[PDB]
Amino acid sequence: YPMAVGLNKGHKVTKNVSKPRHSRRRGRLTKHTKFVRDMIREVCGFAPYERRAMELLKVSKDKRALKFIKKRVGTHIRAKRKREELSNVLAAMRKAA
Amino acid sequence: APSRNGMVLKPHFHKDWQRRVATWFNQPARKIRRRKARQAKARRIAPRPASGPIRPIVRCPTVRYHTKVRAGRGFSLEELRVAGIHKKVARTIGISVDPRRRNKSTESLQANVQRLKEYRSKLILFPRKPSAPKKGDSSAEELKLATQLTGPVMPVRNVYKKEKARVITEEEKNFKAFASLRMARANARLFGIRAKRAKEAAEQD
Amino acid sequence: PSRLRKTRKLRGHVSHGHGRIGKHRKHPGGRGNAGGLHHHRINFDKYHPGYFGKVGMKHYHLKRNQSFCPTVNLDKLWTLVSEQTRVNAAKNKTGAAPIIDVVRSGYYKVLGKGKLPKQPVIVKAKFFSRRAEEKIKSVGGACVLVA
RNA sequence: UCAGUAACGGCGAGUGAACAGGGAAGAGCCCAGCGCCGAAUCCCCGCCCCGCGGGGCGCGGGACAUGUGGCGUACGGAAGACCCGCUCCCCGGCGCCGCUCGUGGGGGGCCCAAGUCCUUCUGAUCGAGGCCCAGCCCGUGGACGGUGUGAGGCCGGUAGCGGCCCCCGGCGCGCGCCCGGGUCUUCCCGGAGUCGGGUUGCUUGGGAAUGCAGCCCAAAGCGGGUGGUAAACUCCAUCU
RNA sequence: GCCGUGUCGGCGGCCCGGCGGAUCUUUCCCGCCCCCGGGGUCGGCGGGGGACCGUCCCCCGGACCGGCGACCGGCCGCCGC
RNA sequence: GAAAGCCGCCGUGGCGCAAUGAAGGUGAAGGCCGGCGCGCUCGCCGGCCGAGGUGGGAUCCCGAGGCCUCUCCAGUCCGCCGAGGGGCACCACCGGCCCGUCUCGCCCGCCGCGCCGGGGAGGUGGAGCACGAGCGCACGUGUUAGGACCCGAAAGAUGGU
RNA sequence: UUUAAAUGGGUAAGAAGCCCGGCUCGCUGGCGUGGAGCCGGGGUGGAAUGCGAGUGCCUAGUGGGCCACUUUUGGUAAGC
RNA sequence: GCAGAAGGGCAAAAGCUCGCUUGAUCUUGAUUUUCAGUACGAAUACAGACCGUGAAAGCGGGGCCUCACGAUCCUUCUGA
Ligand SMILES: [Mg+2]
Ligand SMILES: [Mg+2]
Ligand SMILES: [Mg+2]
Ligand SMILES: [Mg+2]
């Protein structure tokens, strides 16, 4: 009983399933590249804003720690992914000792 | 400056508009120029057809136009893959290829695949010196004409169905009404709200 | 035709049809729509009421294709097909009702407008109004929906 | 076309794009990176194959270059190894013959028919006349000049008219280059003081900031950008 | 001899007739989908066919006027030779 | 001949054919007949039709009577004709319908029984409906934007000598 | 200001009027009450004088006035 | 005397005292005044609610009547 408005909208056609376009697999980690970036964060180190960040993230609190990364790196959605990868440095330093 | 009952008007002539005027006195002089750009191209090519390659069946976007069929850019890889021809050999056959086009329907996928096999069976190629791989004898008895016109297989051909006559039965003259629009129109907009009240009674204990 | 116009008949008279006193100068009232509140106010009410102010919601980047639906009401409803159909439709063959889809005629919604004739139909449209479906359900017709 | 429309604006005066749709025209590609091949690459000089109108592939020396030239590769995916059934190619140069659709271009010099009889006049190109073949020519009655108004006296104009001289795009002997496609399996897969955020100017229809620029802060990798009302949550779309 | 307008017929020329029609025919004909190498109208798809209706082309009758469409015969009254 | 002609599966598009609301959205046919539900201030089923009514309304229709060389018997006509009838456009009025709001209210519907859908009755807002009139071209007048009927500054800006 | 002119202002001088019969109502209410509405019928000659009216569109110029009887305000008066 | 500037009006009152109150509330139109026959303001007659007062008919949607005030755009609060 097909109709144009509603929750089951539109002319009912059948889907073409296919392997996706190759450019959409663009920022994958590709383990060799994971090796390169992880080899280089121990020859080089951490930025001065993010060494001050993990010295709030171990003792002070986390809500004031994210509000700090909110300001230096731009958005909110970048601030949480930066915060949970600092907490995983802080876990690998402490909890693997 | 105004007067009795008339229109209030915004002519956009407050800018120096006499310098940027474009008067079309050469417009017959250019229509007879780009006829010559077609004629002296059509005999320039070959018995290869005028007006370029073959285009796909393509349905238009944007609800106003989605009921019709247009000629597109290129057939693309998915449709070239099923038809069997190579993606870079296709444009020396005379078939345009648009690799950035997607197929997400199967009805319109098979339409252009049926279109593209129909083309190759009414195509005759010319081997250089007559070895002829995948080609036979004398060229379709000299190919019945020379050069085509404004589209190979009449690329719009917007066609509709017959659907001749039915008898008005019960459950058909009874149900599918205006009310089924208004209820389905309401159920789309009360859908996210009612699934929020459903969470509220699940946290009710 | 500069021959047939007023300035030939008005050539020889001193003020050229503009007055000895007023003596048409350049722009005595202001240029364009000047004074629309101030000294041309009596003109802008009484001939353009409503002309100044906000009235609604702002809608950024509307596209004039999403709200597109042409309408055919029931008086014009039978000219979409041949006149050869409906004379063939009523010749004692059962209740065999012909199809009329307005979507291949370029219409989306079927509205009401009285005197739909006595034959049964099936009407294929994307939308309907409830006056229109109860004219069609009154002549024994059906009202089938399409997306 | 949308459209003087959504929008901007002492919301005053004014300003004001786009997407579908119809057409013109249509054509696509390459690198860095990731690996692979013993730098397999280029420039310059010297004498020569052997040449015209000079450019080289061939020979031996000096450099460039591993801080990375060249080959196969680019996001539509790619590579290697399999297995499977095909296949022998294209490019330029050199001679010469055959054409070029208005019938290839450039230049020169040519190609119809009254100056007949009377008559006017400074002088005619005026005016009148030419058998029942219509006085003559006409694919030539555009024009201009000649003592005045000229199809025929003269340049010309008409014509896939003729003949001349040079220049041009493309068939065939000798160089140079030359294994593609499908299926599966394994491995590879990308551009940073950039994106973005803040604030400050300009600009835009772009409005809780469309674009650009300064200064400050400065990324990620199932990431990033966009989805036209700021934000948090989520799902989907789309692009790279 | 003649053509106009309604009535038709010979379905005549429809298969050696034109066009038009979102009339009809799931028994025709071609490339296919739906189940157990074959099969079921078993519901259709792309294309072609041929019936029907609408209008324009000839044959025989019939209807009127023979209307600025005409010629021949005969009549009247003019005309010139 | 920079003309003219043709296209139609080149009508895409433009304006018109449908209005209303900020918007979500909705979106223009009634009158009679026969019967029934408490014929309940409300309605329901079937048939007939089909844009309601009133008052004016050009024109047209009917028309007793009237008008003609001798009197009773018949014809076409024409003129006059009181009165009567169907009434165009159009105007005034009353009623109806569609959209927005407002008050009062009750019933129905089911791809799912709900902070769901539909309907009613009265009152008001609209540039509506109530059997379509526009579109193209041309000309005229008027208004406007442009140097704008011609001529006129004192000023202002850029860049130079 | 008790009283109160003259000139002046509005209305009326019929058929959209008058009379009679019936019917609707949810308004009104002792009440076949009240009042409107609608339908049906019955009778045209309704002061003088003069004149053919009704309507709709588009619309220019104008937006400095000035004088005289008579009535009046300011001013001593004024071609104020 | 009725708040005041004047005029109108007003006597078991529109004045004075007392008793109860919040109609100085909610809502759609119509009309008048200024007038272009527009708005604002102010006013009139209603109608639909909800209330007051009174034994009651009634009266009351501010002041006995004539003046007592203000668009677009912006902000603010309120309403479903
Ligand atoms: Mg004059
Ligand atoms: Mg004038
Ligand atoms: Mg003037
Ligand atoms: Mg200056």
PDB file of N, CA and C in Angstrom, chain A residues 30-91:
ATOM      1  N   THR A  30      46.060   0.839   9.524  1.00  0.00           N
ATOM      2  CA  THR A  30      46.980   0.084   8.661  1.00  0.00           C
ATOM      3  C   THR A  30      48.318  -0.259   9.312  1.00  0.00           C
ATOM      4  N   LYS A  31      48.304  -1.256  10.207  1.00  0.00           N
ATOM      5  CA  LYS A  31      49.220  -1.542  11.317  1.00  0.00           C
ATOM      6  C   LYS A  31      50.668  -1.088  11.172  1.00  0.00           C
ATOM      7  N   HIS A  32      51.194  -1.137   9.948  1.00  0.00           N
ATOM      8  CA  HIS A  32      52.487  -0.536   9.649  1.00  0.00           C
ATOM      9  C   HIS A  32      52.517   0.953   9.988  1.00  0.00           C
ATOM     10  N   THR A  33      51.427   1.673   9.735  1.00  0.00           N
ATOM     11  CA  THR A  33      51.380   3.090  10.092  1.00  0.00           C
ATOM     12  C   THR A  33      51.199   3.273  11.595  1.00  0.00           C
ATOM     13  N   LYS A  34      50.508   2.337  12.251  1.00  0.00           N
ATOM     14  CA  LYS A  34      50.464   2.326  13.709  1.00  0.00           C
ATOM     15  C   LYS A  34      51.853   2.157  14.294  1.00  0.00           C
ATOM     16  N   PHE A  35      52.688   1.355  13.636  1.00  0.00           N
ATOM     17  CA  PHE A  35      54.063   1.191  14.083  1.00  0.00           C
ATOM     18  C   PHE A  35      54.850   2.484  13.973  1.00  0.00           C
ATOM     19  N   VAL A  36      54.655   3.234  12.888  1.00  0.00           N
ATOM     20  CA  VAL A  36      55.448   4.434  12.651  1.00  0.00           C
ATOM     21  C   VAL A  36      55.108   5.518  13.661  1.00  0.00           C
ATOM     22  N   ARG A  37      53.817   5.742  13.909  1.00  0.00           N
ATOM     23  CA  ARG A  37      53.434   6.781  14.851  1.00  0.00           C
ATOM     24  C   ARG A  37      53.767   6.399  16.284  1.00  0.00           C
ATOM     25  N   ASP A  38      53.740   5.110  16.610  1.00  0.00           N
ATOM     26  CA  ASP A  38      54.102   4.696  17.958  1.00  0.00           C
ATOM     27  C   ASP A  38      55.606   4.606  18.145  1.00  0.00           C
ATOM     28  N   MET A  39      56.359   4.382  17.065  1.00  0.00           N
ATOM     29  CA  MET A  39      57.810   4.464  17.167  1.00  0.00           C
ATOM     30  C   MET A  39      58.234   5.902  17.383  1.00  0.00           C
ATOM     31  N   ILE A  40      57.425   6.855  16.941  1.00  0.00           N
ATOM     32  CA  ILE A  40      57.889   8.227  16.982  1.00  0.00           C
ATOM     33  C   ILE A  40      57.414   8.992  18.211  1.00  0.00           C
ATOM     34  N   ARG A  41      56.457   8.477  18.982  1.00  0.00           N
ATOM     35  CA  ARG A  41      56.084   9.155  20.216  1.00  0.00           C
ATOM     36  C   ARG A  41      56.982   8.791  21.379  1.00  0.00           C
ATOM     37  N   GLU A  42      58.008   7.980  21.151  1.00  0.00           N
ATOM     38  CA  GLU A  42      59.014   7.744  22.164  1.00  0.00           C
ATOM     39  C   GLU A  42      60.379   8.267  21.775  1.00  0.00           C
ATOM     40  N   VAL A  43      60.570   8.671  20.519  1.00  0.00           N
ATOM     41  CA  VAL A  43      61.782   9.395  20.154  1.00  0.00           C
ATOM     42  C   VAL A  43      61.601  10.884  20.356  1.00  0.00           C
ATOM     43  N   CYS A  44      60.366  11.337  20.507  1.00  0.00           N
ATOM     44  CA  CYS A  44      60.041  12.743  20.346  1.00  0.00           C
ATOM     45  C   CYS A  44      59.343  13.299  21.570  1.00  0.00           C
ATOM     46  N   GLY A  45      58.318  12.623  22.050  1.00  0.00           N
ATOM     47  CA  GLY A  45      57.706  12.964  23.303  1.00  0.00           C
ATOM     48  C   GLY A  45      56.333  13.573  23.129  1.00  0.00           C
ATOM     49  N   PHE A  46      55.947  14.355  24.126  1.00  0.00           N
ATOM     50  CA  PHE A  46      54.624  14.936  24.224  1.00  0.00           C
ATOM     51  C   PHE A  46      54.736  16.449  24.151  1.00  0.00           C
ATOM     52  N   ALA A  47      53.645  17.079  23.746  1.00  0.00           N
ATOM     53  CA  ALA A  47      53.586  18.521  23.661  1.00  0.00           C
ATOM     54  C   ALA A  47      53.476  19.128  25.058  1.00  0.00           C
ATOM     55  N   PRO A  48      53.860  20.397  25.228  1.00  0.00           N
ATOM     56  CA  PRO A  48      53.752  21.010  26.555  1.00  0.00           C
ATOM     57  C   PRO A  48      52.340  21.230  27.044  1.00  0.00           C
ATOM     58  N   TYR A  49      51.340  21.264  26.174  1.00  0.00           N
ATOM     59  CA  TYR A  49      50.000  21.390  26.714  1.00  0.00           C
ATOM     60  C   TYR A  49      49.505  20.065  27.241  1.00  0.00           C
ATOM     61  N   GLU A  50      49.979  18.969  26.676  1.00  0.00           N
ATOM     62  CA  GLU A  50      49.464  17.660  27.018  1.00  0.00           C
ATOM     63  C   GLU A  50      50.335  16.940  28.028  1.00  0.00           C
ATOM     64  N   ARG A  51      51.430  17.546  28.452  1.00  0.00           N
ATOM     65  CA  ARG A  51      52.049  17.093  29.682  1.00  0.00           C
ATOM     66  C   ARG A  51      51.439  17.790  30.876  1.00  0.00           C
ATOM     67  N   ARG A  52      50.943  19.014  30.686  1.00  0.00           N
ATOM     68  CA  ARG A  52      50.170  19.673  31.731  1.00  0.00           C
ATOM     69  C   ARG A  52      48.788  19.053  31.848  1.00  0.00           C
ATOM     70  N   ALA A  53      48.291  18.453  30.776  1.00  0.00           N
ATOM     71  CA  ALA A  53      46.970  17.846  30.833  1.00  0.00           C
ATOM     72  C   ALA A  53      46.983  16.575  31.658  1.00  0.00           C
ATOM     73  N   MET A  54      47.992  15.729  31.465  1.00  0.00           N
ATOM     74  CA  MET A  54      48.022  14.482  32.209  1.00  0.00           C
ATOM     75  C   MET A  54      48.455  14.662  33.654  1.00  0.00           C
ATOM     76  N   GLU A  55      48.899  15.849  34.061  1.00  0.00           N
ATOM     77  CA  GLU A  55      49.143  16.090  35.474  1.00  0.00           C
ATOM     78  C   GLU A  55      47.933  16.697  36.158  1.00  0.00           C
ATOM     79  N   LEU A  56      46.840  16.882  35.430  1.00  0.00           N
ATOM     80  CA  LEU A  56      45.534  17.056  36.036  1.00  0.00           C
ATOM     81  C   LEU A  56      44.731  15.782  35.972  1.00  0.00           C
ATOM     82  N   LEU A  57      45.013  14.957  34.984  1.00  0.00           N
ATOM     83  CA  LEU A  57      44.234  13.772  34.716  1.00  0.00           C
ATOM     84  C   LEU A  57      44.610  12.628  35.634  1.00  0.00           C
ATOM     85  N   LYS A  58      45.758  12.711  36.308  1.00  0.00           N
ATOM     86  CA  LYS A  58      46.100  11.724  37.320  1.00  0.00           C
ATOM     87  C   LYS A  58      45.676  12.127  38.723  1.00  0.00           C
ATOM     88  N   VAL A  59      45.635  13.420  39.043  1.00  0.00           N
ATOM     89  CA  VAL A  59      45.386  13.805  40.426  1.00  0.00           C
ATOM     90  C   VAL A  59      44.160  14.691  40.591  1.00  0.00           C
ATOM     91  N   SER A  60      44.032  15.734  39.771  1.00  0.00           N
ATOM     92  CA  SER A  60      43.180  16.862  40.160  1.00  0.00           C
ATOM     93  C   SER A  60      41.698  16.541  39.991  1.00  0.00           C
ATOM     94  N   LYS A  61      41.260  16.381  38.742  1.00  0.00           N
ATOM     95  CA  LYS A  61      40.042  15.707  38.286  1.00  0.00           C
ATOM     96  C   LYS A  61      40.137  15.567  36.774  1.00  0.00           C
ATOM     97  N   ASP A  62      39.073  15.038  36.191  1.00  0.00           N
ATOM     98  CA  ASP A  62      38.979  14.902  34.750  1.00  0.00           C
ATOM     99  C   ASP A  62      38.137  15.991  34.110  1.00  0.00           C
ATOM    100  N   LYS A  63      37.126  16.504  34.818  1.00  0.00           N
ATOM    101  CA  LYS A  63      36.231  17.501  34.236  1.00  0.00           C
ATOM    102  C   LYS A  63      36.942  18.827  34.015  1.00  0.00           C
ATOM    103  N   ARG A  64      37.859  19.185  34.903  1.00  0.00           N
ATOM    104  CA  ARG A  64      38.710  20.341  34.673  1.00  0.00           C
ATOM    105  C   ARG A  64      39.803  20.008  33.667  1.00  0.00           C
ATOM    106  N   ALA A  65      40.097  18.722  33.481  1.00  0.00           N
ATOM    107  CA  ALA A  65      41.113  18.319  32.516  1.00  0.00           C
ATOM    108  C   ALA A  65      40.588  18.398  31.093  1.00  0.00           C
ATOM    109  N   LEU A  66      39.333  17.997  30.880  1.00  0.00           N
ATOM    110  CA  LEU A  66      38.744  18.101  29.548  1.00  0.00           C
ATOM    111  C   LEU A  66      38.452  19.540  29.175  1.00  0.00           C
ATOM    112  N   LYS A  67      38.107  20.373  30.157  1.00  0.00           N
ATOM    113  CA  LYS A  67      37.861  21.785  29.895  1.00  0.00           C
ATOM    114  C   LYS A  67      39.141  22.490  29.478  1.00  0.00           C
ATOM    115  N   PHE A  68      40.288  21.943  29.870  1.00  0.00           N
ATOM    116  CA  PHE A  68      41.585  22.419  29.421  1.00  0.00           C
ATOM    117  C   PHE A  68      41.866  22.022  27.980  1.00  0.00           C
ATOM    118  N   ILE A  69      41.510  20.801  27.582  1.00  0.00           N
ATOM    119  CA  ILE A  69      41.732  20.363  26.205  1.00  0.00           C
ATOM    120  C   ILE A  69      40.656  20.928  25.286  1.00  0.00           C
ATOM    121  N   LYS A  70      39.484  21.241  25.841  1.00  0.00           N
ATOM    122  CA  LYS A  70      38.464  22.010  25.132  1.00  0.00           C
ATOM    123  C   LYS A  70      39.016  23.328  24.610  1.00  0.00           C
ATOM    124  N   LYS A  71      39.909  23.961  25.367  1.00  0.00           N
ATOM    125  CA  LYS A  71      40.376  25.285  24.987  1.00  0.00           C
ATOM    126  C   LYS A  71      41.540  25.228  24.010  1.00  0.00           C
ATOM    127  N   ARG A  72      42.433  24.255  24.140  1.00  0.00           N
ATOM    128  CA  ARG A  72      43.657  24.357  23.362  1.00  0.00           C
ATOM    129  C   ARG A  72      43.480  23.717  21.994  1.00  0.00           C
ATOM    130  N   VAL A  73      43.168  22.426  21.954  1.00  0.00           N
ATOM    131  CA  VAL A  73      42.603  21.860  20.741  1.00  0.00           C
ATOM    132  C   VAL A  73      41.162  22.343  20.651  1.00  0.00           C
ATOM    133  N   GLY A  74      40.652  22.507  19.440  1.00  0.00           N
ATOM    134  CA  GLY A  74      39.430  23.259  19.248  1.00  0.00           C
ATOM    135  C   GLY A  74      38.117  22.774  19.828  1.00  0.00           C
ATOM    136  N   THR A  75      37.583  21.684  19.305  1.00  0.00           N
ATOM    137  CA  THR A  75      36.180  21.375  19.488  1.00  0.00           C
ATOM    138  C   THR A  75      35.985  20.512  20.728  1.00  0.00           C
ATOM    139  N   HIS A  76      34.737  20.141  20.998  1.00  0.00           N
ATOM    140  CA  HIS A  76      34.492  19.178  22.058  1.00  0.00           C
ATOM    141  C   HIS A  76      34.750  17.764  21.594  1.00  0.00           C
ATOM    142  N   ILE A  77      34.458  17.472  20.330  1.00  0.00           N
ATOM    143  CA  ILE A  77      34.550  16.103  19.865  1.00  0.00           C
ATOM    144  C   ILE A  77      35.999  15.701  19.630  1.00  0.00           C
ATOM    145  N   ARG A  78      36.904  16.668  19.526  1.00  0.00           N
ATOM    146  CA  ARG A  78      38.331  16.400  19.494  1.00  0.00           C
ATOM    147  C   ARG A  78      38.921  16.322  20.887  1.00  0.00           C
ATOM    148  N   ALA A  79      38.262  16.943  21.860  1.00  0.00           N
ATOM    149  CA  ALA A  79      38.787  17.003  23.214  1.00  0.00           C
ATOM    150  C   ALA A  79      38.598  15.701  23.969  1.00  0.00           C
ATOM    151  N   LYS A  80      37.573  14.917  23.642  1.00  0.00           N
ATOM    152  CA  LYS A  80      37.390  13.655  24.346  1.00  0.00           C
ATOM    153  C   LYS A  80      38.299  12.574  23.792  1.00  0.00           C
ATOM    154  N   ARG A  81      38.490  12.548  22.477  1.00  0.00           N
ATOM    155  CA  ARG A  81      39.376  11.558  21.889  1.00  0.00           C
ATOM    156  C   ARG A  81      40.821  11.841  22.253  1.00  0.00           C
ATOM    157  N   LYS A  82      41.153  13.102  22.490  1.00  0.00           N
ATOM    158  CA  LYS A  82      42.474  13.413  23.009  1.00  0.00           C
ATOM    159  C   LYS A  82      42.574  13.038  24.478  1.00  0.00           C
ATOM    160  N   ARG A  83      41.485  13.194  25.230  1.00  0.00           N
ATOM    161  CA  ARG A  83      41.530  12.902  26.659  1.00  0.00           C
ATOM    162  C   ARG A  83      41.630  11.408  26.914  1.00  0.00           C
ATOM    163  N   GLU A  84      40.919  10.589  26.146  1.00  0.00           N
ATOM    164  CA  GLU A  84      40.971   9.162  26.415  1.00  0.00           C
ATOM    165  C   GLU A  84      42.198   8.507  25.824  1.00  0.00           C
ATOM    166  N   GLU A  85      42.944   9.198  24.975  1.00  0.00           N
ATOM    167  CA  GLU A  85      44.237   8.665  24.591  1.00  0.00           C
ATOM    168  C   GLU A  85      45.359   9.179  25.476  1.00  0.00           C
ATOM    169  N   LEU A  86      45.108  10.223  26.272  1.00  0.00           N
ATOM    170  CA  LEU A  86      46.035  10.580  27.336  1.00  0.00           C
ATOM    171  C   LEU A  86      45.846   9.699  28.551  1.00  0.00           C
ATOM    172  N   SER A  87      44.608   9.308  28.839  1.00  0.00           N
ATOM    173  CA  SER A  87      44.363   8.407  29.948  1.00  0.00           C
ATOM    174  C   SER A  87      44.879   7.006  29.662  1.00  0.00           C
ATOM    175  N   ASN A  88      45.038   6.643  28.391  1.00  0.00           N
ATOM    176  CA  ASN A  88      45.637   5.367  28.036  1.00  0.00           C
ATOM    177  C   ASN A  88      47.156   5.419  27.977  1.00  0.00           C
ATOM    178  N   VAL A  89      47.750   6.603  27.885  1.00  0.00           N
ATOM    179  CA  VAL A  89      49.170   6.723  28.176  1.00  0.00           C
ATOM    180  C   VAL A  89      49.392   6.610  29.669  1.00  0.00           C
ATOM    181  N   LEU A  90      48.529   7.263  30.435  1.00  0.00           N
ATOM    182  CA  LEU A  90      48.637   7.279  31.882  1.00  0.00           C
ATOM    183  C   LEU A  90      48.306   5.916  32.476  1.00  0.00           C
ATOM    184  N   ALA A  91      47.545   5.095  31.752  1.00  0.00           N
ATOM    185  CA  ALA A  91      47.339   3.718  32.179  1.00  0.00           C
ATOM    186  C   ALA A  91      48.532   2.842  31.819  1.00  0.00           C
TER     187      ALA A  91
END
